[PDB]
A paper describes a structure:
The yeast THO complex is recruited to active genes and interacts with the RNA-dependent ATPase Sub2 to facilitate the formation of mature export-competent messenger ribonucleoprotein particles and to prevent the co-transcriptional formation of RNA:DNA-hybrid-containing structures. Among them is the transcription-export (TREX) complex, an evolutionary conserved complex containing a multi-protein assembly (transcription-dependent hyperrecombination complex THO), an RNA helicase (Sub2 in yeast/UAP56 in human), and an hnRNP-like protein (Yra1 in yeast/Ref/Aly in human). Yeast Sub2 is a conserved RNA-dependent ATPase of the DEAD-box family, a group of enzymes known to destabilize and unwind RNA duplexes. THO subunits Tho2 and Hpr1 intertwine to form a platform that is bound by Mft1, Thp2, and Tex1.
Maximum-likelihood variance analysis of the cryo-EM data revealed that the significant nonuniform distribution of resolution resulted from the remarkable dynamic character of this assembly: the two protomers swivel with respect to each other, alternating the opening and closing of each side of the homodimer (referred to as proximal and distal sides). The tips of the C-terminal coiled-coil portions of the Mft1-Thp2 pairs intersect at the vertex of the chevron forming a hydrophobic dimerization core. These two homodimerization interfaces appear to be the pivot point around which the rest of the Mft1-Thp2 coiled coils and the attached Tho2-Hpr1 platforms swing with a seesaw-like movement. Thus, in our cryo-EM reconstruction of a THO complex in a resting state (e.g. without substrate or energy source), one Sub2 is kept in an activated conformation at the proximal side and the other Sub2 is in a flexible conformation at the distal site.
Numbering used by the authors:
A (entry chain I): 148 to 169, 191 to 249
B (entry chain J): 158 to 238
C (entry chain C): 210 to 235
Write the structure that this text describes.
């Protein structure tokens, strides 16, 4: 639980500083091991972004389905009449 | 290897070791502190993506609901007889 | 016949859910 003294921001990165401003963090794993997973963890985050894009595509397909659902919706509005 | 060098003084080499050990702590700590936290933000994004996937599944269900409705129309033609 | 009427009512409920679904899509 040390103090970064802007140095923490200098190495960890300015943008992250938000949550860790608003230490006592794990260092049990080997830094070489941590560097390797962070390559892979960053890859996993990229995969998650790709998945979010896929979910948006799924939402667009759902919207096409909703436009066919639209004729049924017009019939329903007529029924509510 | 500097400890057993001929003209080397032990004090200086001990000082180098402290700086080295501290540098080890900092790099490993920065990578680990990012890894999990950035990955946790990615996981929250993934939960949003799963909610979007559930919405896509619901659109598929509405389409299959339409198929069920068509089957129901065929059945009505059938309590017509 | 009661089951057929109930199926018609379920279809009306699905149409109702249809409006909520359109709202969510918006």
């Amino acid at each position: 639980l040390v103090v970064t003294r802007a140095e923490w921001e200098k190495e960890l990165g300015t943008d992250l500083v938000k949550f860790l401003i608003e230490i006592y963090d794990d260092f049990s794993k080997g830094p070489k091991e941590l560097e390797s997973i962070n390559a892979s963890m960053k890859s996993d985050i990229e995969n998650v972004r790709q998945e979010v894009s896929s979910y948006k595509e799924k939402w667009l397909r759902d919207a096409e389905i909703f436009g066919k659902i639209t004729s049924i919706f017009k019939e329903e509005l007529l029924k509510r009449d | 290897e500097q400890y057993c060098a001929p003209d080397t003084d032990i004090r200086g080499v001990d000082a180098q070791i402290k700086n080295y050990l501290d540098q080890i702590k900092m790099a490993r700590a920065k990578f680990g502190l990012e890894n999990k936290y950035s990955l946790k933000e990615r996981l929250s994004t993934l939960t949003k993506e799963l909610n979007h996937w559930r919405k896509e599944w619901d659109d598929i269900e509405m389409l299959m609901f339409g198929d069920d409705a068509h089957s129901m129309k065929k059945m009505i033609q059938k309590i017509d007889s």
